[PDB]
């Protein structure tokens, strides 16, 4: 099957950084032909731990940055929700409708994202146990989504830290596409990039459906996740090798 | 002020059934006259596990259900919301606004809520630290609260199980006035109840600002949270409990 | 029943340092005459993290210092062994055979501690579940020991953080007497202190049978958990509040 | 040197067993020329939940039946001691001394281990972070040991579960040769065996020096780990398996 690669920017700190990252991403996609290529860049950081960081231009400016990647690169889309009246308007340019983790199991948030008959991708909550996902995507199915992820992106050990169970992506498999989120994994809520590779390398030789990360070209000036997200420059890189890494040890992904 | 009791069945099955839970609330003010009690139900389990759970009887119906009782009663009301849009409507009857423990990281539902006027309890979500807790405070400050509350109801121990950290009492009673959640800090997220009375002994030896419990005629019919629920008839001789408990430890709780 | 108070410098520094402090502990023997005092000094650290730590003076050396208190005082002994072979020997001064966290799996050391006709205390490993110390309480009667105690010290929580889930005290009751160490538990394994005093209340307000507590002269110089030791002056103050709670708490615990 | 593939029956229920097993890790020795095997087999299981369950045939037996195997097959060997006095007689036969998981922290023994002048493998306590292991490193080195592994065994993920926090393989790496245990790092404490080939497949992709596997004729029926030794049948497979992955990934192993 295609695998999928969700990338972009953390969060719309502009129009301008969407299409430097978007010229990137369409660069890597004539490339890799193999991969199914996702644009990935939040309208708005609804959660983030201080009132003072940032959060966003507001969901008008982000749906027009995106449709600008979109119209400019010929790229798929994928944003986050946040409340139910969002939903409709993200619809209209993302392929994928995304639900943050803490909000997985808000049931009006879920149904709103699944009638829109877009794909939707759920990011597991860090209090969430692989199992416990099955209802998930129920709630998903009976609200009338037919495509549907589940993410991978850590969970809660001990206090401000989070810890990659790969047994999971076996056994979310049994239900959803499953997608691994390098970037989130590994960072410390409330050290870390040194094994975003790592870890990456490990999810694929597992086997799953795809990857999700949030690259920027300067990390260090992002306005979110500075500590984790990929240096832009990298992600070639990193795209080819796990793409030669799941190749190998696909013959042994074990059948659901 | 005085030691807070947060109590009433988990969700609004009927306005018949938050008469009757209201009536023994109301009793139990007249005999406990140094308690503050605040009756609390749901109006809605927006976070059910299945989407085949009882959810509830609407907004509407809940809010008018909560009115008969601070009505009949002249007893103080509690409720959460979900969705920013819900806090006006809510403040109508809610002297104090509850916040999901999901939902504790949600600025905007944390700003609609403190805008009201009303007091603000945040559930602690189970993926939070105890020190990760004093930029939620200060998100609603900024958002004008001026009476807010932190509530203790267990963090993410493995999967499936809650573990109650009583070092979190403490802490955060640095930043605001606690309360701890006696029913939800020992239900098993996707033997419980033999448990309740013996942890709110320690949360009151420890020291707190008030406790929460969820109470029902009949537990066992309850629509919700039935293996938790504490059964009506034990509400007084537990309150009884706790009040001569603390009597004595409060002479050693801890300044600040 | 008489409720049990085992406390002692961590570490046998010394004879003196052990004389110094049984004193006190014979002085509040004589005030708290509802409960049993057991002195506790390890003859030798076998598990510090770094080579370069204090360990001790030896077994010969350390059991002749105990000897001294127990003639000195007439106080009753406990020590703790870490191979099969220092039973014997410690058995003949030790009252209570104590087995290290990390050791209580071991069958042989269990065994060889209970065939000395010497009470045992078990500390439950950090690894522990509540409900897997039955077995271990079994080793214990299949090898003859007629007195046995459980005792929690906190459960692995992450990285370098110990969590006590207090509902481990009713669990644990089932099968043998509890004891709460209350000084251990909040140490962090590889911000402290100051939870010491507020997690003692709550275990005997949940109830157990005795407390256990590292005191010494001037914790700061100890040579052995500097940063848990209570200071001796401390000491009585701490057990008077401790039986105060336990009295008035004490018709709420509930029976196995 | 080379890959190193430590693997046997879990305990000696027989010298008979031994060296039907010893046969096949002879032929896949010869097969796998770039392949450094060990044949593992506890003497004894000191640590057993229950008193009634199997520990084995005593170490004198064990000894004996290990030294068979060495004789009739040439193979390197290994298993553990639980009490220092072991560690002599041990090394007569074994090239490794393995260190229990429990244990790890217990100086004495890692002393004696070291002392014999034989290479030392640590099993890595569910406890202990993995920076906690430089230490025990650390001790192993002043004990005059001169070949140390660290092997990655899980780590306590609430209770009767353990998670293996991939992370541990780099930072373990700093300081000794990594192995990663795939049988018992997917054992839950006091649906386990479908987890092996998964996370052993994550542990070549992230990067180790080996992997430690329990194999068994009819595991159903060892008298140990029945639930997780692997059928010996599959043994090759999923060597060869590794040894391709590793082959592709070692390219982005990162150095020190």
């Given at each position: 099957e295609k695998f999928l690669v969700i990338a972009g920017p953390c969060a719309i700190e502009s129009e301008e950084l969407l299409l430097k990252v978007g010229e990137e991403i369409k660069r890597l996609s004539?490339?890799?032909?193999?991969?199914?290529?996702?644009?990935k860049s939040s309208f708005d950081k609804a959660n983030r731990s201080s009132i003072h960081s940032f959060r966003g231009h507001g969901l008008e400016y982000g749906v027009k940055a995106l449709r600008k990647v979109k119209e400019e690169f010929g790229l798929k889309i994928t944003t986050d929700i946040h409340e139910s009246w969002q939903a409709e308007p993200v619809?209209?340019?993302?392929?994928?409708?995304?639900?943050?983790?803490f909000l997985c199991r808000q049931t009006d948030?879920?149904?709103?994202?699944?009638?829109?008959?877009?794909?939707?991708?759920?990011?597991?909550?860090?209090?969430?146990?692989?199992?416990?996902?099955?209802?998930?995507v129920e709630k998903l199915?009976?609200?009338?989504?037919?495509e549907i992820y589940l993410t991978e992106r850590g969970t809660?050990?001990?206090?401000?830290?989070?810890?990659?169970?790969?047994?999971?992506?076996?056994?979310?498999?049994?239900?959803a596409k499953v997608i691994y989120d390098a970037t989130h994994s590994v960072q410390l809520?409330?050290?870390?990039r040194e094994f975003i590779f790592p870890l990456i390398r490990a999810a694929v030789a597992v086997g799953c459906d795809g990857v999700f990360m949030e690259?920027?070209?300067?990390?260090?000036?992002?306005?979110?996740?500075?500590?984790?997200?990929?240096?832009?420059?990298?992600?070639?890189?990193?795209?080819?090798?796990?793409?030669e890494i799941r190749e190998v040890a696909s013959k042994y992904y074990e059948t659901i």
């Amino acid at each position: 099957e295609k695998f999928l690669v969700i990338a972009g920017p953390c969060a719309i700190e502009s129009e301008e950084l969407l299409l430097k990252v978007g010229e990137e991403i369409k660069r890597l996609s004539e490339k890799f032909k193999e991969v199914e290529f996702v644009f990935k860049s939040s309208f708005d950081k609804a959660n983030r731990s201080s009132i003072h960081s940032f959060r966003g231009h507001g969901l008008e400016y982000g749906v027009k940055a995106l449709r600008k990647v979109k119209e400019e690169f010929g790229l798929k889309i994928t944003t986050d929700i946040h409340e139910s009246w969002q939903a409709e308007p993200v619809a209209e340019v993302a392929d994928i409708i995304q639900i943050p983790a803490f909000l997985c199991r808000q049931t009006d948030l879920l149904l709103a994202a699944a009638k829109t008959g877009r794909a939707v991708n759920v990011k597991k909550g860090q209090f969430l146990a692989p199992w416990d996902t099955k209802n998930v995507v129920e709630k998903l199915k009976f609200g009338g989504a037919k495509e549907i992820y589940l993410t991978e992106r850590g969970t809660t050990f001990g206090y401000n830290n989070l810890v990659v169970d790969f047994r999971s992506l076996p056994i979310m498999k049994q239900w959803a596409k499953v997608i691994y989120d390098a970037t989130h994994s590994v960072q410390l809520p409330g050290g870390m990039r040194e094994f975003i590779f790592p870890l990456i390398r490990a999810a694929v030789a597992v086997g799953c459906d795809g990857v999700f990360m949030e690259t920027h070209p300067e990390p260090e000036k992002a306005l979110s996740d500075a500590s984790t997200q990929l240096p832009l420059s990298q992600l070639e890189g990193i795209i080819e090798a796990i793409l030669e890494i799941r190749e190998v040890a696909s013959k042994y992904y074990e059948t659901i």
